[model samples]
Each structure stands twice: as C-alpha cells, then as structure tokens.
Target: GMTILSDVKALGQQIWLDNLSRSLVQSGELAQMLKQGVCGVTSNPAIFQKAFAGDALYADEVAALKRQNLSPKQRYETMAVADVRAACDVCLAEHESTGGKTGFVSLEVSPELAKDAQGTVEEARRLHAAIARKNAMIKVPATDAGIDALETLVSDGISVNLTLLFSRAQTLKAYAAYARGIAKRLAAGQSVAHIQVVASFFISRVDSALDATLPDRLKGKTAIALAKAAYQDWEQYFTAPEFAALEAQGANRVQLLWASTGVKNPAYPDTLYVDSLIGVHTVNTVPDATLKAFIDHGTAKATLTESADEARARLAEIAALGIDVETLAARLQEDGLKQFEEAFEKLLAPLV
Candidate 1:
C-alpha cells in the first residue's frame, strides 16, 4: 500500500483522502495516512451527515452550542469549521513540508450559497477567517454564480477549491477566473504568493450520467476522456507565455483536482477512475473504499497523458452522436448542487 501511494506521488500527482471525521483524526488514522503520503483532504455535506449521524464525539460541543441562541446552520458551521481547522493542523506538517503544495484541508461553504453570488463570496470570506488556517481552502460550487463569487474570493487572496465541475468548458471558465483574480491581486500590489486554488473536475459522475445513452464501447469512456482533454487544456494554459508574468509575480499554477474518483458502476473496477487519471500537478480525492482498493492493487503511471489523441477522438465521436457534453455538464452540476443542499439540510437538522 505504501509503495502504491508513494509511486503515485512519484509520478507528480497527489492523493487526498475525501473522508474526514473527528474520530478519524483523533484516532491517528489520518495522521498515519499523512505519513504515508496522503497530501490533502476534502469533505462534503454527505460526509458530515454520515460522520455526525453515528458519533457522540461532538456531543459536548453540540450541547454547548444548543445553549447558545444560534440557528441550526450556525451550529453546523461551527462544528464543521472546527473539524476542518483540526484537520488543517493535523496536515500542517505536510503543508509546510511541501511548501504549501499539499497538506491542505477544504471546508465547503453551505450549499445554499451555490446560486447566490454575493452571499457565496461573503460566506467564503467568513469561513476562511473562521478556519484561520493557512492550509485551509474554502470550497465553492462551480456554478456560474459560484465562479463569479470565487473570483472575488481569489482577488481577496483566499484559497479556493472549486468543486462539482464536470466538463472541460467549466474547467476552462474556472481557470480563466483564477487567472483574472491573480492578475487583479498583482495589480493591487499584493503578492500572488500564498494564493492557491484547485478546480475539482468530477470523474465517474460524467460517465454515470451519460452511460445509458452511450454505446457499449463508450460506456465508461466519457469521464476519462473528458478529464484527459481537460488536462491537456491545463498544460496549455498554465505553461503558455500569457501566464508567465503572473508566474514571475510568484503565483502558483492552479492544479486540477479529481473529485468523485470512486467508480459508481460496481461492474467497473473500484479503482477505475483513480488509476486512469494519474498525472503531474493534479490531485485525486479518494473516498475510503477507493483508497483501499488503489492501495491493494492500483498501478501508478503517467496514464493521464497516455492515448491523448485517442481520447480526443473518442470525445469527438461521442459529440457526433448528438450527445451534448456541455449541456449534460450543466445538468449534472444542477443535480449535484441539489444533492449537496439536501445533505446539508439533513446534516444540520435538530439533534434527536
């Protein structure tokens, strides 16, 4: 397992744990993984719902919170921000040790802000200050409004994890916004240094959304092809001379993060998404099950750039068949936003 994880790192990609809980950190499981080269972490409403659902570890805190005149949303944020702050401390060594490239912890803004532009920016600012950890990232949905809000957050020098992105089009939009933000910061005499961001391009969900309409040969190919194409765009944009001024101004290239890396179709290998998307300057946030599967038998290589031309060809074929990747992407993002909102509601419900 160590060898597999290390090999992936050696190939210049990061492996982040997508599951986090108070007990997981307190029990030393997360620290152990950090030592084993787990570079970062991310959490979502569903993860919180599951963790808080069965655990009494937060009882004292909840009890204390109950005494306060606070809304359920306020109490939930308090609890979640605390967990993310703790996670940031746990991974601080790696964050510093890696010179800020890794060891980051992400705490998403409430899903309710997904569509409200100004509200999203305000909440992201508040969350960033609440966590007060340099390695902490305020996660924002990649909605049109969310990206606009993200631009403001970025210009203010907040690190962001742009999540729920499912297509190359959205990926491009995010990078452009990131570049604009960095440029604004530089123009304002602020150092682009310490401003880190990553656009999370979702993996398996793309295929899962399109598989029913895809031919047998194209069943599991859409997502990987989409990711591969997006990576190509990343290379072109980040390395192009247009970004040279910003790079010289001390800006770090925004990395592409792979979210939803776990395979959904049981018929596909558990590590299908993870194994196929390994490359430099990218991050893969793996759930517990997928992490274990990869550790057991995942092979690491420069697979992201492999069959590059073929990936494009396949994507073109899918397009030729009247499958609208862009429209499908928008629909998936809407569905994903709803799912997160539902999970957030459930997670913040009054205690039993």
Candidate 2:
C-alpha cells in the first residue's frame, strides 16, 4: 500500500505518530503504521491522559492497578510504562534496522519535575530503567533545569527527547547540551554510538499564541519562519568542527522533531506544519487526524531548506514590528508546561 507517508519518507523526513495507546500497539495498527513509514512514537502527559481516559484496553489494567498499594501517580506510571514498553517492542525491528536512528518510543518524565533539575534526572533515570528498552527515550522539558539534566542523562547513556521548545534560542541550547554530553561521554572513553536525542521544537502553538497581535500577512507565517531559521542553525552547529569531531566518534546529531504540528486555525491548510517542515534529518510527529489528512492529499517535498533567506527575512519583519520572539518563546514554554502539569494531574486522579 504505497501512500504519501512513504513519499515523505523518500524525501528524508521521518513521520512519527504523536499519539499512542495500548490498543494502537496491540491491535496491529501500530505495526501497520510502521510499514506505512511511521518510524517512531512520542507521548506526553496530555496524550497519555487522553489514552487512559478513552482506551478500553486500559480498563483491566486500571482495575488491577487500583487493587495494588500504588498511589495515583504510581498507578498511572504502571499503565504508561507498559504501554511504552509495548510500543518499543512493536518498533524494535525498525529500531534495529535503522541502527538506532529511528523507531524510538518516548516516555516523558513527570511534568511536575519540569523545573527541578535533580528531580528530573532521578525520575528520568527511573522511567528509563522501568521501560528497559533500547528504543525508549525519556522526554524532558527544555527548561533551564531540563537542559542541565539532559547533559547528565546523555552522559549516562540515556536517550532523551527534549520537549516544549519554541524558539531558536531554546533549540540551540538543547543542541549545545547534547553535544556537551556527548563530549563528556567520549572524554570518559564511553561508547557514544547508542545514545540518541531529539529536540522537540513545537509549532502551530507559536501562531496560536501570536496570531491575534500580528497582521494577517504574518499570522500563520511566524512559526514556519522560526522553524526554518532553527533548521539552518541546526545545520551550522552540527557540521562545525567541534561537533564534527564528536560525529566522527559515533556521536549522533540531535535531530529536530516538529511538535504541536496539528493545525489549530480553521483558515490554515490542514497539513501546514508537516508540509512546510519536511527536510532531511528532521521529523514531524503528527496527530491522527493530521496524519490522515497528509496521507490523503499532502504534498511531500523538501520545503524546509527551500527558502532559508526568505525565512530569515520573514523573522526579521516580525522583529521589526516590535515583536520579541524570545519573550514569546519563554511565555509559550511556561504555558505549555502548565498545560502538561494540569493534564498530568487529571491523568493521576482517575488512578486513585
């Protein structure tokens, strides 16, 4: 069954499902998706909350966990850990075939630890061990503390999916932290070949956040411009002499994963985020609806690197209008963290 997803794969972009559940993995749907070119899975507090509340396959597990002596959070983790492990198994062949480049399933640490460096590191370690899969990636928010935790996790040979990024500054910091971590591992004579990372730079939310204040010309353009500029920066940073040395020693580049890609605006094209951000060495984690929309009609091309200068010019136009993208990025990250925290709270409540 040739599909547009496979077409996108041919263009060098990997498509990862942004949603996951027990049924999705157990019912053969996920395996079928892998054949259709979905190379990985990424889950967050909100995504897990949705799956737990709606998926019937979780009912028996929820009942069983409730009979145990687990707290609400513990019970939630019990279910989430199993789901992530199953997803990892389902994608194991892809993982091995890619030589550890793709097919990773991300399980995020508690959003409550978003700003706690030590807490994040500890919990990330616990979750990584709990999943106990080579393809498992512990997702941490790209907060100041999270960045510090990321370096430590990488040096410890833990794969990480750094989330909630909204600006080039945040993405660059994440890239630097990953490189530093790799450098540290190499310094200790540790194997750096198996450690993996993806900086989950969020899209669509930027437009959702700033569209109201911008002229119509700039409303839907800012996020894409920011992504393009960030991609350019990614190319420069990873190819530089410092990281080039690390790469020669089997250090992987922290590829960018496009998140929040589902279109929120009615007037916008449904595949706006996915179509615009297609490029080599990047990923687009799409919700089910957006994935279907893309499969049906989305055009796959190398749009990400197509207009680097124009992308910079668009960003400059926004900056000239007195828009402080850095400030907006900070605010968006905070808002996103709070949203995840609230969802986590809701997710645990039913477990009790």
Candidate 3:
C-alpha cells in the first residue's frame, strides 16, 4: 500500500514537517521522514520553545552563548541559526535534487519587528546571511509592515515563507508583493530560478473563531472553504498571461502553504485540514501528531479541486450570516502575531 504521505506527494503537494528540534534532527528521525516523503521543515517561536523546554541537547551551547554580551534576541538567533544550519545540511540532498524547491527550513524574523517594515527587512537579510544555506527561508508574518518588507526582501533575492496569513485578501496581497519583487528583480537581471516563496494560509483557526457564531450547519466548514477559495485565486493569478514572462525566465510560481493544520477542536477529526486540502503546487506543514494520524488512516486525493462551487456557496452563506470574513482575517493575523510574540518571549527567557 502506498503511504498517505507519499500519495500526497504523488498528487503534486509537498509535505513539510512543522516542528524541528536538536533531538529530532540528530536522532535521524527527520531524515527518516524525508524517505517517507516529508520534504521540508517549518519552525516558529512556539515550536522552538517546545524543543528547548524539556531538553538539554542545547544546554552547552546555550551556556556558552549566555556568557556573551548579546541581547536575548541575538542569543536566541545564535542558537536557532545553528540548528537551522544543521537542518539545512540534513536537507541538502533534497534541496539539490529538487533544484531548490523542497527540503527547505524556515526561520522567522523576530515577531517584535512585525510592525516595522525596514527593521523586518534588515533582520531577514541578516538572518538569511547568517544561516547561509540556500534552502533556508525567512518566515515573515503577513502583517502590514511585514508585507511591505516582503517585496523588498524577495527583490533582494531572499526566499520567503510568508506566515500567519488568514484570508484570501491577505493572501492576494502577498501574491502582489511577490510579483512586484519578481518584476523588479527580473529588470535587474537577477535569475529567480532559486527564489522560492510560499504563502502560508493558516488553517483550523477560522472555525475556532467562528464556530460558536455559526449555526450548526456551518460549523467546521469555514476554514476549508476559505482555503479552497484561496487556491482558486492562486490558480488564476499564477496561470494568467501576466506571469508568462517571469515563468519563462525561471521564476517559480508562488505556492500556497497550509499552516497551523492540526485541528484545534476536539469535535473534529484529527486530520481535518490535511485530508481536505490536498492538491497540486501547494504545501502542507503538519505537526507530528497530525502527521502520524494521517499516515495511519488518512486519504490523499485531489480534494481541493473537488468542490469549487460548494466552497464558494458556503463562503457566501458565511458572509450572509453577518460574519465579515475579510475583517476576521485581519483580526486573525493580528491574533496570530500576538501569539507568536508571546511565544518568542517564552523562548527567549530560558536562554537568558
């Protein structure tokens, strides 16, 4: 029997692990997942905080770095950069084989800089350089300032994984920013063959926010509907003739990444988002539990293309019920940013 993870890849979607740790990487478990069809890694402050809390794998390095006169943020980066560098090396074979498409690891810019465009840009560039791996992507929140900095970062030739996206509108904004960067870079004679970008649309949170407000008929449905609509937008935007010149010049199509995929509501099945959103040219980053659940019994198919009309109708009904999804998306992004900020603070504390 074909593994569900492998079957997902066969459907043209990439499977990326959402958590990374020194033990996970060093124990060869991450490499083992690669053989089973996991091709990428994504890390955030929360993920790192979990990795650091119950382990001593990084104790010596933390102690050494703590002795230095660095600020908490700087010390945090020093530790994170080392782990990211190692993960890059682990994924080097996949990165080379995929021609820079897969096996990448993402390190986010400081959450504190989410509202500072220029500051985000500088830190992203600095972090990218410090990590110094071709497969490393800097994760930038899709806040207003981060969106502004996203174009500039990509124009300067850094690969980006735009994080905390919640709505089609926000995702579209990110697409425009990426296209702007590619257009400018092409004029400057830079080759975009190695420039990879994924718009990470967060899943599950939609229902978590609106489930109570929705009548029983609409519960557990908004997130998938929003995701399907976003896919349609991506399909049309990237396939249009406007992108023809860039595609011909080696620019990879901007892909969507499904983030926060683990189902938050216990009433739902464990792999709710994973089972529903499989399709071509997208990526799904799942945590260990969700990944295991899917492997154990999940179905992989071209489900995103299965219910276009239904998705749109459901989304309309959701709006008709007085839930402004676009505004809700902005709110979600703000909440996501705040959660990451709180987590980053926790991640920084034990180090200091």
Candidate 4:
C-alpha cells in the first residue's frame, strides 16, 4: 500500500504524502517519497507538534535551542525549517527535472496569522528564505489574510499551496487570489513560469459537516456536487481569454487539488471520491486506503466531471433542499477555520 502510492502518481497525477515530520526526514523516507514521483508534501501545526513531542529525534535539538535562549516560536522554527528544507531537498530533483512545474513541499506560515495578511506574508517570506529551496512552496490557510498574502507572495514570485479551503465559494476565492497574483506578476515583469499553486478544496469533510442536516437523499452527494460545480467554474475561468492571455505570458493555471479525500463515514465506499471524480488537469490527494482501493477495484471514469450541465442540475437540486451552497459555504469556512485554529492549539499545547 505504501509503495503503490508511486504507481498512483505515475497515472498522470501528483501524489503528495499527506504526512510530514522531522523524524521521517532524518530517516530518509522523505527523500524516498520524492524519488518515486511524489510531487509535493504538506504539513500542519498539528503534525509538526506531534512529531516533536514524542520523537527523541528532535528532542535534543529542541533542548539545545532552548539553552540558546530561543523563544518557543524560534525553537519550533529551528525544528520546522530543517524538515522543510530537507523535504525541499528531497524533492529538489523533481523541481529541477520538471523545471519547477511539479515538485513542491509546502510549510504553512503560522495558524495565528490566519487573519493577519501582512504577517502571513512576512512569515512566508521568512520560511521560504530559511528553507533556501525554490521547491519549497509556502502554504497559507484560505482565510481573508491568506488570500491577500497569496497575492502578495505570488507577486513577489513565490509558490503557494492554498490549504483549508472547504467550499466552492472558498475555492472561487482562492482562484481569484491566484489569478490576481499572476496578473500582478505579469504586470511587474516577473516570470510567472515558476510560480506554482494549487487551490486545495477538501472533499469528505463536507459530507461529514452536513451529514446530519442533509436529507436522506443528499447524504454523500453534497461535496461531490460542489466539486463538480467548482470544476465547471474552473473550466469556464481557465478558458477565458484573459486567462488564456496570461497562460501565454507564462502564468501557470491554478489546478484544483481535492484535499481531505479520505472517506470519513465507513458506510461509504472506500473509493467514493476517488472513483466518482477523476478529471484531467486536476488532482485528488487521497490517503493510503482510498488510493489502494482505487488501484484494486476502482473504475476510473471521466464522467462526474464532464457533463457539467448535469453537475449544475445536481447543485441546483442540492440548493433547493435547504442546503444552501452559498450559506453552507460560509458555514463550512467558519467551521474549517475553527478546526484549523483548534488543530494549531492542539499542536501548541504539547509544548506547553
């Protein structure tokens, strides 16, 4: 199951390990994943905090940093920057091999800066420079600050991985930020060619949020329908003459990456999201189980995404069922922000 992830990536999509840690980097598994076409990596405060807590791998390093009078924030960076730098090194070949098209490892700035636009940009710049790897993509949560910071970062020729987006509305917002940034880059004579980005819209989390409120008829379909609609919007936006002109000028198209693809409800099929939504020019970052299920029994059909008119119909039906996609988008964003904040606190509490 672990190694087959490489094969999954070979099938014309990028498979980034959803997990990251300093120990794994020290052990060389991070490098192993990169050689096998694992295109990128992502981390949260929760993952890093858990990594630092129990693993003696970084305990000594942390202690040494503490003795040197570094603040806890500085200590955290002492650990995180190393891992991000190493992960960036592991993927650096792909960054070179693909000429900066695919390989990227994302480290988010800080959860506390979720609402501070300038602060997020400042931290992103610091981390990006600290890592010293062009393959390192600075992650920023999809808050209003995140959106503004994304533009600020991209305008300065930084790559970004927009995380924690949970709705079509959020995805739309992310794309607007990306497009605006790319436009700014073009305006300023910056080379938009090397700036990579992915608007990560979460999948199964949507159903988990609405499962109780959804009518029996709409249990597992809300997230999928929303994704379809979002994709439809993507197709429309990317093909527009403005976007086409930008593409001609070297601005990369912002691909929609399906995040949180794991099926939360065991009653749902293991490959629920993976099999249901496989389209070209998009990504679905599944955890180990769902990827394996797809390799075994899953049928890869390009159906759910194609008949966009039908997707629109399904979205209309869902909106009619009191699950207002608009209102639900705001609700999901708020709930996601809360979970994000909680996860950050959970990570910090370990140190406390």
Candidate 5:
C-alpha cells in the first residue's frame, strides 16, 4: 500500500511499536501493524504497568493469580510472560522471514535489579527461559551493572536490548560490551547467528532533561544531535576491520534502536522524533500517539546521516555554554531507573 511506514522500512530502518498489551496482540491490532511495516515490539515496566492497569483483557488472569499462592512479583511475571509470549507469536513470521534480525519483542528485567549485575543476569535468564521465544529480547538497562550482564548474556547466546542510553559515551560502552560478548561466543565456538541486539538509545528524554536549560536555537535539537553523533560512532565501530572480522564469522552488529521517541512538548511537532531520526540500519520504537502521527503525516527520508557537521557544531555550542552533558547523562540514567522502578512497584501492587 506504500504507506509512509513502508517507505521508512524501505530505507532500511524498521519501525517498532513501543507499546504492547494482551488486547493489542490478541485482538490482532499488533498483527495489523506488522502488515503495515511495524517489525517489532518493546515493553518496559512503565508500558506493562499501563497495560496491566487499564486493559480489561487481563482481568481473568489477574483474578486467577490472586487465588494462587504466588507472590506479587511472580503473579506479575506470570501475566507478563503470557502477553510477551503472545506478542512474540504475533511477530514470529517477521522474525523467521528476517532470519532473526527483526521481529524481536523486548521484555525488560526488573528495574530493581538495574544496579545488580548478577541479579539482573539471573532474572534475565529466567525471563528468557520463561518466554522461550527465539525472537524475544531480554532488555537490560545501560547502567554499569547492566552492561556487565549484557556481555555475559550475549556470550551465552541470549539476545539483548540494552536500554536507557542517553549519551554517546554510554552508547559506546554498550557497543564495546556487545562486541566483547560476540567475540567470546565466537571463541567458544558457539553459533552467533541467532543472537541479535539493539543498543536502545533514548531520544526525547535527553531533550526533556536539557531543554529547559537551553537557548532557543538549541532547544529540541540536542537529542537528535546526540543520536546522529552516536550513529556515526555506530558506523565506525561496526565497520572497523576488527568488528568486520567478527561480522564475517556470523556476528551481528548491534543496531541502534531509538527509544523515548515521542515528543514531550506540545509545542513541537508530534512526529518530531520519528521524522528527524529516520535512517538505514536503525529502529525507531515510537509510542502509539507518535506512530499514528507519523503514519498520517510523517516525512520518511534518510535524515539521520545528514547534517553531521552541524550536529557536531550544536554539541560543541552546548559544551561551550558550560553544560556538562556527560554528567547530565549519568543523572538522566539514575532518574530513568527510578521512574521504571516506581512503575514496577505500582504494577506489582495490584497483585498483592
């Protein structure tokens, strides 16, 4: 049908639905989007909280779990696992058709374990086993501890979605971990072809944090600039001779998936994130509102690689303004973890 999303897909970028729920999957709405070029699904504590709290489709299962001897966490997982399994099935065809590169549905570990390397790894392994879908991606945060878990998980041949990345430095750290994992898998003679990963670099949150402090010229521009800068780093790292050797041996380069892409300010264009960040080899995981806005009136083009020098200039200007983006990135990571933790708490409360 040549929809804008299809055109975006044709440019080598995949459009993923950033929200998932039982109703979305079971009612066939997700499948319908899959036909329209949405290739994957991403769910986090916040997203799942909304689904569990508002979706009537979950009532029966919730009631059944209440009567069981399950703890709140266990009950939450039971329902979440079912939804994730169903969502994975909905995307299974796309998964197979892409040879495991695309149809991934990301299920995040408990945000409480964000700073616990071993705990994060254990829970991720448990969830991965529970979902038992080849296309399922265990999402780990980009915190130091989570990055540690990432290498181990990848070396173990489990796919990952490394989330909450705010700065180029954090994103690069994630890339290093991914490569190290891939290398370890290859050295162990394990098959690396089935392993897939996306470094989920968050977009709008960066600006949302920095916008209030910025000049009008740089407002609404920082996140996209940082994303473009990180994309350059991605190209350099993955295309390097060292990583190229890994790639030759069936190791996949971790693509950057754009997260937190819905515009936060009402004054800005609703599709600002989606429209500005379109590029090949990237994934834009947009919220429903942003996705619909894009589907209706978004521009689809290779805008990511354009204006590289200008992006650099903008970053330099921000630095000149005495803004320490690196420090802000760390702060944003901490704040992001708290938001997810609160959502996770709320999600589990009902089960208790």
Candidate 6:
C-alpha cells in the first residue's frame, strides 16, 4: 500500500501537513516529512485548540509561556509562531529552491477577527510581524473582512493563505484581492515576483454542512460542485488580460489551496477529498489517517476535477431543488466562526 503523502507525490500531488505544533518542529517530524516530500504546513484555530489541549509535549511549553506572562492567545501565538518560524526554517531550502512558490508555513491570525476586515488586517500584520519568518504565509479567513485583509497584507509584502473558503464568489474575491495587492506592489516599484498567496478552499466540511439537506444522489456533491465551479472561475480569471498583465509585470500566481481534506463522515471513503483534488500550485493537507487511506487504496489521478459540463448541470439542478447555496455559505461561515469563538473561550478560560 502506498503511504498517503508518498502516494500523493507518486501521483504528482504535493503533500502539505495540515498541522503545526511545537514538538512537530522541535522533534524534527516536519523536517522528516520534508525529506519524504512534504511540501509545507498549514495551521488553524481548531488545530491549535487540540494541539494545545493535548499534554503530549506542549503542556510544558504552555506552562512556560504562562510563566512568561503571555495571555492564552498570546501564549498560543508564542507556541504557534515558534513552530511557524521553525517550520519556515525547515522549508527555507524549499523556498529558496522553488524561487518562492513552495516551502512556506502558515500561521492564522486570531479567529475572533474573522468577520472584522480592518481588525483582521491589523491582526494579520501583527501575526505576520510576530512570526517574523521570511516564508511565513499568514493565514486569514475567507470572510469579507479577510478578503480586504488579504490585499492589505500582500501589498505590505506578506504571503497569505486565505482560509475557510467554500464558494466560487468567495474564491473569486480572494483572487481579485491578491491581484489587486500584486498590482499595488508593482505600481509602488516593489518586485511582485516574490509575492505569494493561496486561497484555502475548504473541503469535507462543505459536505458535512450540506449533505443532510440533499437527497442521496446529492450527498457529498456540494463540495465537489463548489470546487469545480470555483476552478472554472479560476481558469477564466487566471488567463484573463488583467491577470496576465500582472503576470507580465512579474507577479506571482495565487494558488487555490484545498484545505480541510480530512474525512468528516464514515459513510464515504476516508480518502475521498484527498484523492479528489490534485494540482501543482494548489495544496492538499490531509491528516495522517486520511493520508494512510490514500496510500492504502487511493486511485491517484489528477481529479482536481471531473466532467465540468455535467458538474455544472448537476449544480444547477441542486439549486433548482431549493437549496440556497449562498445562504448555506453564510450559515457555514457563522457556524465556523461560532465554533472557533467557543474553542477560543474554552481554551482560554483555564488561564483566566
């Protein structure tokens, strides 16, 4: 059986770790994966909550940070930014080798600001600066505020991984923000060639949020449909004159990263999402179990998509059935934010 990451690479897919933690870096686990073809790293509040909660090895770090007078959030950032910097150092060779396209580590700003545009921007800058790593890709949500924060960060020369995306409209706005940021940089005499950004379109959760609302035929289709249409829009804008103009002006491409690929339900194959999306620029960071499933039996092909014509028709058919996708997108965003807030509060309450 193929290991998920090795198997993923065997199929021409780049494997990024969906997790970050102090021991993962201090123990050289991430570096080991780098040698095994792991491309980069991704972080989020859920991951942080669980990682910090686990006394596996980080409890000591948390205690130390607490002794240092850091608040829970600050304590979390201390650990996270330390790992981010360490991961960035491990991937620095990849960064230098890829001319800036690969070898990056993402650190998300406070999830509390997911809905606050200027607040998100201000926090992103603070996190980016705090991380203080050349290859740190500041993680911002794909919230409305996140879109604005993304442009502001990129113009200020921060690479961004816009997280929590699920819809075509959100993805396009993210792409436009990156484009605008690159334009502003180039216009300001900065070399846009070094700027990198990725729109993190989440998977799995899309199905979890929408599957129950659909008939059996439509189960698990919401996520893939949104992915396909998002890709179609990406293709349209990717080659458009405005984007090409930026490209000609030495701007880097903003990749569409596929995040949250872990299986949420047992009904589907564990590797469903990881096995589906594969591309060069984009990234898919499957958890170790999902990685194992893909290695054991994944079909390994560039299914970054399939049958756009039929997929488009299927999506339209679902919309006709009265599933208001836009509404669900909003609902999911609120749910996600609420969940983060709860986790943050619970995680911090102990410190208070």
Assess candidate 1 and give its lDDT: 0.90
Candidate 6 residue 169 Cα shift, in angstroms, is 0.9
Residues 1-352, candidate 5: write the lDDT tens digits. Answer: 2389889988889999999999999999999888888999999999999999999999999999899999999998999999999999999999999898899899999998999999999999999999999999999999999999999999888999999898798888888898899999889888999999999999988888888889999999999999999999999998999999999999988999999999998878998999898888999999998898998888998999999999999999989999888998899889999999999999999899
Over the stretch 1-352, how does candidate 6's per-residue lDDT look in tens digits? 5355655665555778888777788797888878777788887777777777774777777667767766667776677788788889999988788788778898877777887889988888888888777788888878888888888888998888888777778788888888888888988899777788888887888789778878888898778777777777887898899999999989877778877788898898887887777755567877767766776787767776677787788789788998777777777777877887787777676554
Residue 247 in model 5: lDDT:
94
User: What is each predicted model's overall lDDT from 0 to 1?
Assistant: 0.90, 0.92, 0.90, 0.77, 0.92, 0.79
Candidate 3 residue-wise lDDT, 127-242, digit = tens: 99999999999999998888899899989999999999997888888888998999999999988899999999998888999998788888999999999999999999898888
Residue-level lDDT tens digits of model 2 in 225-337: 99999999999999999999999999999999999999999989998999899999998999999998988778888999988888888899999999899999999999999
| TM-score of every candidate | 0.98, 0.98, 0.98, 0.90, 0.98, 0.94
Better of 2 and 6 by lDDT: 2
Using TM-score as the measure, name the better of candidate 5 and candidate 6. 5
Better of 2 and 6 by TM-score: 2
User: What is the C-alpha lDDT profile of model 4 across 1-352, one tens digit per residue?
Assistant: 4454454454445666666777777798767766654677777676676677767787677667767766567777878888888887878888798788777777877777888999999999988888989888888888778988988898888888888776677777777788898888788887889888888887887888778776777778878888888888888888999789999898888888888887889879987887677776776766556656766777655645666776677678777876777676667767777776677666555443
After superposition, the stretches of candidate 3 with alpha carbons farther than 4 Å from their true spots are none
Model 6: residues with Cα > 4 Å off, grouped in runs: 1-12
Model 2 — TM-score against the truth?
0.98
User: Model 1: residues >4 Å from true position, as ranges?
Assistant: none
